[PDB]
Amino acid sequence: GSISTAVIDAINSGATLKDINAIPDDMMDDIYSYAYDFYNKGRIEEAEVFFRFLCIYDFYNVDYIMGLAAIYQIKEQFQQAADLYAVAFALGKNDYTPVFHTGQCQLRLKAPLKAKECFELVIQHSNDEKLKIKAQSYLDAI
Amino acid sequence: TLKDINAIPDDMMDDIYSYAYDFYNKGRIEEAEVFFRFLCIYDFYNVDYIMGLAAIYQIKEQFQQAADLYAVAFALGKNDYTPVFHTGQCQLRLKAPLKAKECFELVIQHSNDEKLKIKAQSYLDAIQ
Numbered sequence A: 001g002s003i004s005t006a007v008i009d010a011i012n013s014g015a016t017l018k019d020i021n022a023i024p025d026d027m028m029d030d031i032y033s034y035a036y037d038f039y040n041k042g043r044i045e046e047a048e049v050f051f052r053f054l055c056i057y058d059f060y061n062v063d064y065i066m067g068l069a070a071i072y073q074i075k076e077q078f079q080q081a082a083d084l085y086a087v088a089f090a091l092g093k094n095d096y097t098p099v100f101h102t103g104q105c106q107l108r109l110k111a112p113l114k115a116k117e118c119f120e121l122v123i124q125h126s127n128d129e130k131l132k133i134k135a136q137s138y139l140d141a142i
Numbered sequence B: 001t002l003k004d005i006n007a008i009p010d011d012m013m014d015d016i017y018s019y020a021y022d023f024y025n026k027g028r029i030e031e032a033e034v035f036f037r038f039l040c041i042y043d044f045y046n047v048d049y050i051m052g053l054a055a056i057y058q059i060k061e062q063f064q065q066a067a068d069l070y071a072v073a074f075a076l077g078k079n080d081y082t083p084v085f086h087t088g089q090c091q092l093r094l095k096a097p098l099k100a101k102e103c104f105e106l107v108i109q110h111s112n113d114e115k116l117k118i119k120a121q122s123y124l125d126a127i128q
Ligand SMILES: O=c1[nH]c2cc(Cl)ccc2o1
Pocket: A085, A086, A087, A089, A098, A099, A102, A117, A118, A121, B078, B079, B080, B110
């Protein structure tokens, strides 16, 4: 998937498509909008192809990663979603939404201790008060 | 992954990992890089294998390539902030002090590793 592609690219350390600016920013913006057009109409498979395409070109992009993680979470591919949410957080650092969603994924992965750590981080560090309420409601049930 | 099909026994992979670190510790960087690349081909999902290759890239002053692997390495452990610490170092070398500051601050705010936080704080203290 997207992560193995990123790791292969780093191993081989050859020229990538982004390194040569093979797709301009404006076209990447268009494709991202098309990806969500598919997603918003429930065409999840096509959206996934488009977000995979975006993540091959520019993996280290919080917006592309978050789109793909959402798809995996909807498809109940919870480990793949949590892995991408963690990448997104490492790049973004200031938005705790991926940490919240990782907590949800860990709950489904039968890892309540990992989920608890996620929700507690949201509570202690997020300034999104509504997200904190949601995290607390998961914490109350664990 | 080749790991998924158990193409090489577990103990032999342990041996290869320890040999890679031997090369690294002896300054045999080119050989260590071959061995860590070998490991990461065998199992891209092994955080310690990725961290080894990232360290090689950082030593070779390929700071963006190192930072890219550190971001993957962080996701593959979720709770270990050491790759975030090293990313902060790489960002300083890339002349991105605000990005570096964010990394070291994240270590201090989330990590339970007290020795690592001590190191991150010493970087934060130095950043203008
Ligand atoms: O300690 C941590 N930080 C984390 C960040 C994400 Cl995205 C998930 C789990 C975590 O555990």
